[PDB]
Design an enzyme around this catalytic site. Sequence first.
Site, mmCIF file in Angstrom:
data_model
loop_
_atom_site.group_PDB
_atom_site.id
_atom_site.type_symbol
_atom_site.label_atom_id
_atom_site.label_comp_id
_atom_site.label_asym_id
_atom_site.label_seq_id
_atom_site.Cartn_x
_atom_site.Cartn_y
_atom_site.Cartn_z
ATOM 1 N N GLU A 179 -0.474 9.766 -8.342
ATOM 2 C CA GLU A 179 0.714 10.372 -7.737
ATOM 3 C C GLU A 179 1.406 11.232 -8.723
ATOM 4 O OE1 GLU A 179 2.222 6.857 -5.867
ATOM 5 O OE2 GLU A 179 0.901 7.032 -4.226
ATOM 6 N N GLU A 235 -5.559 4.653 -1.829
ATOM 7 C CA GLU A 235 -4.417 3.813 -1.354
ATOM 8 C C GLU A 235 -4.148 3.910 -0.157
ATOM 9 O OE1 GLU A 235 -0.651 3.618 -3.785
ATOM 10 O OE2 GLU A 235 -1.723 3.484 -5.470
#
Length: 444
Positions: A163, A351
């Site tokens: 991220e 995720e």
Amino acid sequence: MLDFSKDFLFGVATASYQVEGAYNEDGRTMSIWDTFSRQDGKVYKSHNGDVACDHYHLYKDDVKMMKDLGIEAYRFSIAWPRIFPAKGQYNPKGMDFYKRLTDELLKNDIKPFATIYHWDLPQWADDLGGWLNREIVEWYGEYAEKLFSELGGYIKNWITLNEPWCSSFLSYFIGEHAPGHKDLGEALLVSHNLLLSHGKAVEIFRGLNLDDSKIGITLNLNEVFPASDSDDDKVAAQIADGFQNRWFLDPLFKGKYPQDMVEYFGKYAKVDFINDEDLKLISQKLDFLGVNYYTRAVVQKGNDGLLDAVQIDPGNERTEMGWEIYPESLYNILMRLKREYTYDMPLYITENGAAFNDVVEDDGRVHDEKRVEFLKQHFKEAKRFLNDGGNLKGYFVWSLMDNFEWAHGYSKRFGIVYVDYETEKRILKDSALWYKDLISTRTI
Ligand code: NA
Ligand code: NA
Ligand code: NA
Ligand code: NA
Ligand code: NA
């Protein structure tokens, strides 16, 4: 006959600072998050990861727990401050932990997926400028090269960054994450230096030509909906989509930052870090893309300030994060990648998961039926993507266990396993029992 083939990987995910503990043991020095969590006001009730889930000491029990669930792949991250606790000073005891962890995984038939950088930058690196100092490209490259050479016999699936939107905009513009700056120009340059560092690791990785080894990156992505069909809201959605998604997808997969965002950000900050040489390194071919998906956004035009779209509440069910439960955007994002960015390249959901108000009842169980239904809805969308021809290779639930949720401390619980932090006891939630059945039957 199987909704998910035998080769499809049912996984779970953690990250090093969120679960390991042992923060000052076997040579580990402080990361930016150790420092950030000790700054007054930055983390919920001054929680930190000194101990967390104590996974560093309990890893054998945690791997056995995964084997008994039938877990096929485990995504974890490697702590830079354990491997190089000082600049240029390699720590074999730090490497030894990841060797015994991955040895345990392999001996119980679990495939390791290793995230090289999941936000725990060494404090010594930040004191030299951190992601704002272009020399970090070389330090990160040295770190990654050491992991490839020492662990290449153990790990065959590598993720460079987790991220980068969080490590840049949330950390340097919004200021919620470490090191907590609030400066748009800094966040933009950091975004570039992160991507350049990813590029350097990919260059090193290809030069090693490791047998049967794959490298990718992990991006948190959403889907942005305009609140109405007005031209005002259409531009608002376009800016919000460029901010979260295209600012990273475009340099990685098109070799060019999205020009509407370069011109937009340029009205407010410098964008002179962009050059042809750097974007060539950034856009090197990957083996897979990891997708972190949680929710959508519905946005309406603000007052023409900097990134000031109004967040609309469409009135549907939400998690304890306040995140709308909208499983269709999982399918929509995966399809958008297939049609606009990644095409036939393998995708992983690295995720997906949800925070709910979990309690252990008098029967000793956690009846987290909202999480059961959340995961069921999202895995049905993954099944739909596969049946429509999408190249989805695996799905990692966030998270194996409740853990340190960054600025929220331990107040948000994402696990399919409950952790009683006072005793470090693990308690399987009903979602873990449901997941175990999904893996065994491969039916949904
Ligand atoms: Na920790
Ligand atoms: Na603290
Ligand atoms: Na690529
Ligand atoms: Na691949
Ligand atoms: Na939906």
